RNA sequence: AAAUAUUAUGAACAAUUUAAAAAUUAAUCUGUUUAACUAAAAUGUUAUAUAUAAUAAUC
């Protein structure tokens, strides 16, 4: 069901903390989206970017997507370090 | 509700004497039996053609008098009781007819097995290759195997207690209405079927 | 197998890997005192008509 | 067949006697020596080395009252993650530190909890826009990021977080 | 043991030392042989599902095309229908009605 | 383990590496 | 940094520590002593000579600084975290082991069995 | 300086309880569905619990945290192994995503049967309750391996001759509904 | 045996991974002198964490959420301004990114001010990066186009064209990668090593920069009605592609 | 004990690689994919600052490289380089002289290798088909004396 | 509380995290084929698979060489930092299909020619961009010449 | 999947079998070598000395 927490129908060394404690906390807490109304009210605002095809722009006319602004073969220079890695070869990224 | 092409191979048959087997039945039972086995039954005298008068009432074989002097009226309670008795006799016949097969691992050519069996495994293989569902509580090992279960390799045998004997009255034809002896052969098999 | 001196590993412990009567203690010990002519060191219990 | 002759010729001075005088005998000896040394280093050296270091650590723990078994198990439990080499180095050169580690393993101090699974903030479910502002989840992520920035070492950015987050307002020129 | 100099493969994982067979998921010799036999039989049955279609003189194997052509080139000079030359070599009779027939 | 009948007997090198103490 | 220590303290990290500034300077970068792996199959005719110069960077640790953020005094024999801190009293009193019930208890020397300790924090 | 990192965002549960309150302790016995035998967690299980991959440098902080930072704060550089480990993480992620998406597609289409398991599992397990209503070499190899895996044992010919097309009927005369007899 | 890559598999060493140095302008020529010719007619900073933040910010800017990218750029730009000295590479680059974020959010006057600051910093820069100066002046051109100064936008675009035709080497990005197909020793299988190819839009970002620059110039020329300028720009772009 | 009992979820920890790595904006509403497709598309190392450039220490692949010889493409592009007879290299299809032994049932072997399992020597120096005394030249008859 | 939960009901499947624990090459070729289908080659490898009947059958066949853990869809949405208002079909449709070893082709020759066709498609993308630029320039030249004539 | 080149490395009984041996064996050409460096790593310590017993007495 929507409103009830996901960990209500579970079928199941006791009294201790297991490795899945941080996960069973979220499983025991109640769900956030409690109705298909709110679910679709979040979905219709949810948007994709890498989707193949046109995208709606009738919201604001002054804004231009980065693809249209800097073409498709060009990407912003990324800080390449041990901490964060960017995707390489956007030409090879396709198929 | 069978298909016509499939029903062409079967024929309605009324059983006079209770016969155990995948193509058998109880005394006074109507069933779709295959052509060859049904003809064999009708030639031996254990079966009759299902006429309306026979569906109403039937004569059956008496074990005490060895003659077809037992007139029986096919009723609902009679059919239910005879079906239950046939089920009991079929379970007994299945568990007392052939061997049970177990295949496990055993490192080396030793005489004991690596992992001894248990009532759960016995019931599992029983349901697997006999199509008989029983609970492990009815399986009682031998005096030597009460400790660790079936451990030797080769041939063994266990006791299986059947509760429903005196209610249906089977103590005459059966050897022992109390219990039955299941002969279990344990062997070494390849990896995929040994699994242990 | 031999994996030690007779002070620690007895002579009847060589066949410890084989299944049967060797995994038990022998009854007769001829290793002490005079040595036998056929050089027999142990003899197990006489099972029926056979003795090891 | 590639017999290592021109390379092993230069090591004949390490041998003695006829192996050093003649060429082929010394070459055979050096070939066999190098082959068996490579085999030992590949398949048998690590066992002996780790056995030695384990015995040293076990002796250092027994001098305090414990054993390698319990020490290793409790180190794995407390999640200290110290290799046997480091344990031996501490036992040999930092006895006080090794004794403190043993006391930590022996005491009933609660070991650290398992790593918490990455959760999603509550603001990600808020309708946006609800009808030129930033997303609430993105703003909270930026705040946590700046907090983690300032948490690592001292820097001239300051300890406050609002002034450092509102740097685009400073860079913006008043129109 | 038909090949007596086994290949030495590059050892990327230590379990490649313990493994003996190169392709473990691949069936053994006799098993893959009977598997290929059954597959070829199934393909041949799929091919012969329909009736044996008869082919003209041009779409014949070379050892029969020229013979079948020269057996009837004499009658081909005179254009008249109903002229058959019963030649020995050719497509054998299937023995059953065929849609192509 | 302990080899049975069919498996040939093989004598391995004695484990001479240093062993830890069996604490109770 | 798994652990930091000195002549008077030691801070362990489970699994890691934070706040430790261990600055070094890269002195050099070169290959180590060559290890020659000679692989030879006694059955066939094929010898492989693989040289391994283990490349490595030599560094000299210049400075080490530690600045922790303690929460409070923690009890050892009991997982409870003390709310107060007293540098004079022992946080956990320890008593000798001599009952007399055991007749075969291996007796050490009397001063070794009975030897109190000082107070370090004072 | 140093990095104390357990998850992606550096957050963890409160490691120290309130002053005076009882602390929480992990499970010492191994995660075994049976109460016997009681077995202490080995060091590899402890590593798996704390988040490593059973080895000091397989996963977790010892592998994700950088090794060196310049004095002025400049980070390290990207290595081939770093990129390969990032691709491995992304591969695990996309495996999970595609598995979940396949499950969702099967659920939306209706190809998830209400009967649990498979035919082999139902013929093998008595605990399962009874429910009552290109190339060809790959395909033939799949058929052969199915014929060799399925039906491990056969009903003896004395009970039912499998060649005559005879199969025994399922019997539940002596079976029980409670799963205690199979779970104990 | 086919690999499944279900376990961790380290990458292979390949000649395409060779680090390439960024192109530097000569010491005698200065961007301010070129612009005048055209007008004639360190303290410790957690740089790892600020780089995490900058990467998240550019990811936001690519996704479309521009205000969050702007604030990320502002944070990391304050960080870089405190860390690096006057007129530094990462400093001017991140403030270029900041001006781009301001323009994508609509603060065009501040965007133009920041890009003019980039210009006056490139004035004092001794050897600025060719890619950095090209991207900076492309940003200024696009900001002028958004403001409505299409003449100045196409002027900056042809300025990029002139700079990269004058002080750029076109064959450096494919020095070590052109003879790679000769490594092919197998033809039936694994023969893609004989057909290896590296798109020029990846190994020298200045080329893609001027490509998109001349594309926007062509769009502006088609909108205005300067067919001669459109033809000139297309000819120069095709010539560049043929050179590469 | 090598029979460990623990949830295999622990074998693959996800605490370090959440969805924020595969989709950087999944916390927000907008969704975008920034993934590393494979290990082959690796541009290589890259400096973070101008002050700290990468070292110039080279690997074996880069160090063990001989000088460049003028190839046919270079000699056809700029014929000013053809100054000697060593520049007139034959067709690149030609590899060179035969440097190995083509041993039957064994492939191409180096010189000085294993000559143990060798039959090509005796071949240069079928019975299973002729075991039943079935000559092909005597099985089929002659259509005519001339053929 | 003692009543059935009201409201709309949704289906929640499972996924299997399967970790190999014994050497697969030691067993027969059929179990090795099943583990290969389950995408396990060596001892110590862990994979993630759906809860479809095919995967259930494979795991039932290899149940003695691998250990399996179950994770429902909500449990996976908790384990990975993905909100609850985002399903997995959209994530699968968004992730690119060019991932490393995308499809198990029936032959390494097919694999090699697939990679070769990918490189060919990249080269064709570049040359088609250049040729489209040339075509647009040629059409602009033609239009300009016609206009200058007229 | 093709075009090519070669192919002699060689078992006698018994048992089972339209499904699987047996313990006096079946099957295998034995168990073939084979590993870049540094580290890490889970692999089996022995004995239990017989309660149908042993130890004792009267009739
Ligand atoms: Mg080593
Ligand atoms: Mg062939």
From TrEMBL, chain C:
GO terms for cellular component: kinetoplast; mitochondrion; nucleolus. Keywords: Metal-binding, Zinc. This is Uncharacterized protein. It comes from Trypanosoma brucei brucei (strain 927/4 GUTat10.1). The lineage of its organism: Eukaryota, Discoba, Euglenozoa, Kinetoplastea, Metakinetoplastina. The chain holds residues 53 to 104 of 156 of the full protein.
UniProtKB/TrEMBL annotation, chain E:
One of its GO terms (cellular component) is mitochondrial large ribosomal subunit. This is Uncharacterized protein. The lineage of its organism: Eukaryota, Discoba, Euglenozoa, Kinetoplastea, Metakinetoplastina.
Automatic annotation (TrEMBL), chain F:
It comes from Trypanosoma brucei brucei (strain 927/4 GUTat10.1). The chain holds residues 40 to 63 of 189 of the full protein. It comes from the Eukaryota. This is Uncharacterized protein. The lineage of its organism: Eukaryota, Discoba, Euglenozoa, Kinetoplastea, Metakinetoplastina.
TrEMBL record, chain K:
It comes from the Eukaryota. This is Ribosomal protein L30 ferredoxin-like fold domain-containing protein. The chain holds residues 51 to 200 of 218 of the full protein.
């Amino acid at each position: 069901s929507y409103a009830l927490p996901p960990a209500v129908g579970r079928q199941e060394i006791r009294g201790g903390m297991h490795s899945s404690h941080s996960l069973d906390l979220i499983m025991r807490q109640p769900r956030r989206v409690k109705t298909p109304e709110q679910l679709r009210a979040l979905r219709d605002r949810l948007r994709f970017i890498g989707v193949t095809g046109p995208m709606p722009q009738a919201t604001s006319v002054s804004t231009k997507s980065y693809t249209d602004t800097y073409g498709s073969r060009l990407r912003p220079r990324y800080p390449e370090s041990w901490d964060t890695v960017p995707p390489h070869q956007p030409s090879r990224e396709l198929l | 509700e069978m298909a016509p092409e499939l029903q062409l191979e079967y024929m309605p048959v009324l059983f006079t004497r209770t016969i155990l087997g995948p193509q058998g039945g109880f005394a006074g039972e109507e069933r779709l039996v295959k052509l060859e086995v049904a003809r064999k039954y009708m030639e031996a005298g254990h079966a009759v053609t299902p006429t309306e008068e026979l569906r109403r009432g039937l004569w059956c074989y008496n074990p005490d008098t060895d003659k077809y002097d037992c007139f029986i009226e096919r009723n609902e309670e009679f059919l239910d009781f005879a079906a239950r008795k046939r089920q009991w006799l079929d379970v007994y016949w299945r568990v007392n007819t052939g061997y049970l097969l177990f295949g496990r691992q055993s490192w080396g050519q030793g005489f004991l097995i690596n992992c001894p069996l248990r009532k759960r495994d016995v019931a599992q293989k029983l349901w697997e290759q006999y199509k008989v569902r029983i609970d492990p509580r009815l399986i009682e090992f031998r005096e030597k195997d009460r400790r660790t279960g079936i451990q030797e390799l080769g041939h063994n045998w266990c006791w299986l207690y059947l509760p429903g004997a005196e209610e249906l009255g089977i103590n005459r034809e059966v050897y022992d209405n109390k219990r039955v002896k299941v002969r279990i052969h344990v062997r070494k098999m390849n990896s995929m079927f040994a699994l242990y | 197998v031999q994996t030690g001196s007779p002070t620690h590993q007895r002579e009847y412990e060589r066949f410890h890997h084989l299944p049967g009567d060797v995994r038990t203690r022998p009854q007769f010990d001829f290793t002490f005192g005079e040595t036998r002519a056929d050089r027999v060191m142990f003899a197990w219990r006489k099972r029926g008509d056979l003795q090891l | 067949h590639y017999r290592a002759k021109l390379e092993l010729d230069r090591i004949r001075s390490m041998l003695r006697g006829r192996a050093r005088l003649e060429r082929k005998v010394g070459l055979k000896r050096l070939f066999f020596l190098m082959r068996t040394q490579t085999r030992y280093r590949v398949e048998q050296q690590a066992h002996w080395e780790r056995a030695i270091v384990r015995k040293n650590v076990d002796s250092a723990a027994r001098e305090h009252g414990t054993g390698w078994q319990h020490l290793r198990n409790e180190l794995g439990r407390q999640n200290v993650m110290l290799l046997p080499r480091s344990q031996q180095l501490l036992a040999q050169y930092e006895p006080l530190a090794f004794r403190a580690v043993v006391e930590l393993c022996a005491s009933r101090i609660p070991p650290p909890p398992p790593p918490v699974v990455a959760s999603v903030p509550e603001e990600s479910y808020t309708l946006w826009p609800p009808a030129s502002l930033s997303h609430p989840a993105a703003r909270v992520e930026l705040r946590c990021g700046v907090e983690r920035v300032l948490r690592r070492g001292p820097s001239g950015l300051g300890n406050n977080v609002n002034e450092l987050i509102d740097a685009w307002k400073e860079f913006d020129v008043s129109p | 043991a038909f090949r007596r100099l086994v290949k030495r493969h590059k050892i990327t994982n230590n379990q490649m030392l313990l493994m003996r067979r190169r392709e473990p998921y691949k069936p053994t010799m006799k098993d893959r042989q009977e598997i290929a036999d059954r597959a070829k039989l199934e393909e041949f049955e799929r091919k012969n599902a329909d009736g044996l279609m008869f082919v003209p003189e041009k779409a014949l194997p070379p050892w029969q095309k020229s013979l079948a052509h020269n057996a009837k080139a004499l009658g081909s000079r005179i254009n008249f229908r109903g002229f058959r030359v019963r030649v020995a070599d050719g497509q054998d009779e299937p023995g059953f009605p065929t849609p192509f027939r | 383990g302990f080899g049975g009948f069919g498996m040939s007997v093989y004598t391995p090198k004695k484990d001479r590496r240093f062993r830890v103490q069996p604490l109770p | 940094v798994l652990m930091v220590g000195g002549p008077r303290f030691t801070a362990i990290g489970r699994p890691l520590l934070e706040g430790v500034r261990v600055t070094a300077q890269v002195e050099e970068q070169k290959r180590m002593r060559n290890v020659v792996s000679l692989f030879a199959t006694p059955g066939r005719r094929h010898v492989r000579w693989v040289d391994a110069p283990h490349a490595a960077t030599i560094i000299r640790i210049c400075e080490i600084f530690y600045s922790p953020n303690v929460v409070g005094e923690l009890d050892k024999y009991k997982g409870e975290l003390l709310e107060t801190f007293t540098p004079g009293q022992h946080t956990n009193p320890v008593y000798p082991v001599d009952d007399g019930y055991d007749v075969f208890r291996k007796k050490d020397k009397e001063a070794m069995e009975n030897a109190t300790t000082f107070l370090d924090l004072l | 300086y140093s990095e104390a990192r357990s998850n992606y965002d550096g957050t963890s549960l409160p490691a120290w309880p309130a002053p005076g309150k009882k602390p929480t302790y992990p499970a010492a016995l191994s995660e075994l569905r049976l109460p016997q035998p009681r077995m202490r967690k080995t060091r590899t299980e402890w590593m798996y619990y704390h988040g490593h991959g059973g080895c000091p440098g397989k996963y977790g902080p010892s592998r994700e945290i950088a090794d060196f930072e310049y004095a002025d704060g400049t980070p390290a550089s990207i290595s081939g192994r770093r990129f390969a480990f990032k691709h491995h993480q992304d591969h695990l992620l996309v495996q999970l995503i595609r598995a979940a998406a396949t499950v969702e597609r099967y659920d939306a289409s209706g190809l998830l049967p209400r009967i649990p398991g498979t035919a082999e599992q139902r013929n093998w397990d008595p605990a399962i309750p009874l429910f009552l209503d290109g190339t060809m070499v790959s395909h033939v190899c799949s058929r052969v391996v199915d014929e060799r895996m399925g039906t491990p044992t056969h009903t003896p010919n004395e009970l039912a001759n499998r060649h005559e097309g005879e199969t025994l009927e399922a019997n539940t005369m002596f079976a029980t509904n409670d799963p205690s007899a199979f779970v104990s | 045996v086919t690999r499944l890559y279900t376990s961790y598999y380290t990458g292979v060493l390949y000649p395409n991974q060779l680090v390439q140095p960024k192109q530097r302008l000569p010491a005698d020529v200065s961007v301010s002198a070129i612009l005048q010719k055209r007008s004639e007619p360190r303290p410790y900073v957690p740089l790892g964490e600020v780089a995490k933040l900058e990467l998240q910010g550019d990811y936001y800017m690519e996704g479309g959420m521009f205000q969050e990218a702007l604030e990320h750029y502002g944070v990391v730009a304050k960080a870089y301004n405190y860390a690096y000295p006057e007129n530094h590479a990462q400093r001017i680059g991140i403030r270029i990114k900041l001006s781009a974020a301001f323009r994508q959010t609509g603060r065009l006057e501040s965007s133009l001010a920041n890009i003019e600051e980039v210009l006056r910093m490139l004035d004092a820069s001794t050897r600025p990066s060719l890619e950095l100066i090209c991207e900076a002046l492309l940003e200024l051109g696009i900001t002028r186009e958004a403001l409505g100064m299409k003449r100045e936008a196409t002027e900056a675009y042809e300025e990029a064209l002139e700079v990269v035709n004058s002080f750029h080497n076109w064959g450096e990005s494919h020095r070590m990668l052109r003879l790679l197909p000769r490594l092919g020793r197998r033809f039936n299988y694994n023969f893609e090593e004989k057909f290896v190819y590296f798109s020029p839009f990846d190994y020298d970002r200045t080329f893609a920069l001027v490509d998109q620059c001349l594309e926007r110039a062509e769009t502006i020329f088609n909108e205005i009605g300067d067919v001669e300028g459109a033809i000139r720009v297309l000819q120069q772009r095709k010539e560049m592609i043929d050179k590469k | 004990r090598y029979r460990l009992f623990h949830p295999r979820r622990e074998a693959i920890p996800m605490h370090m690689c959440p969805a924020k790595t595969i989709f950087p904006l999944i916390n927000s509403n907008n969704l975008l994919v920034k993934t590393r497709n494979s290990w082959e598309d690796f541009t290589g190392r890259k400096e973070f600052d101008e002050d700290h450039p990468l070292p110039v220490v080279g690997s074996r692949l880069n160090g063990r490289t001989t000088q460049h010889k003028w190839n046919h493409w270079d000699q056809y592009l700029n014929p000013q380089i053809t100054q000697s007879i060593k520049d007139l290299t034959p067709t690149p299809e030609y590899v060179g002289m035969r440097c190995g032994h083509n041993m039957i049932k064994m492939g191409w072997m180096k010189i000085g290798g294993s000559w143990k399992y060798s039959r090509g020597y005796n071949d240069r120096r079928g019975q299973w088909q002729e075991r039943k005394m079935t000559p092909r030249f005597m099985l089929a008859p002659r259509v005519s004396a001339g053929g | 509380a003692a009543a059935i939960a009201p409201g709309p009901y949704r289906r929640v499947g499972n996924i299997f995290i399967v970790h190999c624990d014994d050497h697969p090459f030691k067993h027969s070729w059929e179990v090795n084929r099943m583990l290969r289908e389950l995408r396990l080659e060596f001892k110590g490898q862990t994979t993630i698979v759906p809860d479809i009947p095919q995967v259930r059958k494979r795991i039932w066949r290899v149940r003695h060489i691998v250990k399996v853990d179950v994770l429902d869809l909500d449990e996976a949405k908790a384990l990975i930092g993905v909100p609850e208002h985002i399903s997995f079909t959209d994530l699968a449709s968004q992730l690119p299909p060019s991932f490393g070893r995308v499809k198990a082709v029936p032959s390494p020759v097919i694999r090699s020619k697939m990679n070769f066709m990918k490189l060919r498609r990249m080269r064709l993308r570049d040359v088609l961009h250049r040729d489209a630029l040339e075509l647009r320039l040629l059409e602009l030249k033609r239009s300009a010449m016609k206009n200058x004539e007229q």
